[PDB]
Design a protein around this ligand. Sequence first.
Ligand SMILES: *[C@@H]1O[C@H](CO)[C@@H](O[C@@H]2O[C@H](CO)[C@@H](O[C@@H]3O[C@H](CO)[C@@H](O)[C@H](O[C@@H]4O[C@H](CO[C@@H]5O[C@H](CO)[C@@H](O)[C@H](O)[C@@H]5O)[C@@H](O)[C@H](O)[C@@H]4O)[C@@H]3O)[C@H](O)[C@H]2NC(C)=O)[C@H](O)[C@H]1NC(C)=O
Ligand SMILES: *[C@@H]1O[C@H](CO)[C@@H](O[C@@H]2O[C@H](CO)[C@@H](O)[C@H](O)[C@H]2NC(C)=O)[C@H](O)[C@H]1NC(C)=O
Ligand SMILES: *[C@@H]1O[C@H](CO)[C@@H](O)[C@H](O)[C@H]1NC(C)=O
Ligand SMILES: *[C@@H]1O[C@H](CO)[C@@H](O)[C@H](O)[C@H]1NC(C)=O
Length: 159
Amino acid sequence: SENITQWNLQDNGTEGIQRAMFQRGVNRSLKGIWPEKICTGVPSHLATDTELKAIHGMMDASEKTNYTCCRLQRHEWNKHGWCNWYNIEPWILLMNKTQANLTEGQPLRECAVTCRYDRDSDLNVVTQARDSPTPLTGCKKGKNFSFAGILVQGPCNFE
Ligand SMILES: *[C@@H]1O[C@H](CO)[C@@H](O[C@@H]2O[C@H](CO)[C@@H](O[C@@H]3O[C@H](CO)[C@@H](O)[C@H](O[C@@H]4O[C@H](CO[C@@H]5O[C@H](CO)[C@@H](O)[C@H](O)[C@@H]5O)[C@@H](O)[C@H](O)[C@@H]4O)[C@@H]3O)[C@H](O)[C@H]2NC(C)=O)[C@H](O)[C@H]1NC(C)=O
Ligand SMILES: *[C@@H]1O[C@H](CO)[C@@H](O[C@@H]2O[C@H](CO)[C@@H](O)[C@H](O)[C@H]2NC(C)=O)[C@H](O)[C@H]1NC(C)=O
Ligand SMILES: *[C@@H]1O[C@H](CO)[C@@H](O)[C@H](O)[C@H]1NC(C)=O
Ligand SMILES: *[C@@H]1O[C@H](CO)[C@@H](O)[C@H](O)[C@H]1NC(C)=O
C-alpha cells in the first residue's frame, strides 16, 4: 500500500519509450515499484541480464538496448531494490506480476503522472501513470485524458 508503482503508456507523440511502445503495440510497460527508502551505495547483489529478462513484458526506457532489456530494469534494482527486498528473486517475482497485470490491460487503479497535451485532439495524452493520485506535469486544466487510447474525464480513473 505504501509502495508507488509507476509505468509508461504508449504515445507516438513522445520521443523514446512511449513511441517504441506505440510502434510495438504495447500499451503499458512498468517503470518501477518504489518504497520510501532509496538505495545509496553498492548493491547486496549485482543484477544479471538473465535475472532482469525474467520481468516479462517490461521494456527498457534506453534507446541503447532498442527499448528491450536491461538498463532501466537494472537501474530500478540498484536505486530501489536491493536495500528494500534484500534478495533478487522476491523483487523479480513482484516486478513480473505487476507487469503481467499491466499487460492484461487491467491495472488495479490507473492515475496520470505526466501528459503531453495534444492540441489537435484537445486531449491530455498520458505518458506515465501510477496506482495512486499525484501532482500532474504537462496536463492542461479541464481537458480530457487519453490513457493508451482509453478516454477518461479525470486525472485518475477510480473512487
Ligand atoms: C513494499 O516494499 C517493501 C520494501 O520496502 C517490501 O518489503 C520487503 O518484502 C520482501 C519480500 O517481498 C522481504 O524480503 C525478505 O527478507 C527476508 C529477511 O527479512 C528474507 O528471508 C527473504 O528471502 C527468502 O529467504 C531466502 C534465504 O532464506 C532461507 O533460505 C530458504 C531456502 O532458500 C528459504 O526458503 C527461507 O526463506 C530461509 O529463510 C532467500 O535466498 C530468498 O530470496 C527468499 O525469498 C526475503 O528477501 C523484505 O523483508 C521486505 N522489506 C521491507 C523493508 O519491508 C514489500 O514486499 C512491498 N509490498 C508490496 C505489496 O509491494
Ligand atoms: C494482479 O491483479 C489481481 C486481480 O486484480 C490482484 O488480485 C487481487 O488482490 C486483492 C488484494 O488487494 C485481493 O483482495 C483479491 O483477492 C485479488 N483478486 C484476485 C482475482 O486474485 C493482484 O493483487 C494483482 N497483483 C499485483 C502484483 O499487482
Ligand atoms: C528495434 O526493434 C524493432 C522491433 O522489435 C525492430 O523492427 C528494429 O529493427 C529493432 N532493431 C534496430 C536495430 O532498430
Ligand atoms: C512472469 O510472469 C509471466 C507472465 O507475464 C509468466 O509467464 C511467468 O510464470 C512469470 N515468471 C516468474 C519468474 O514468476
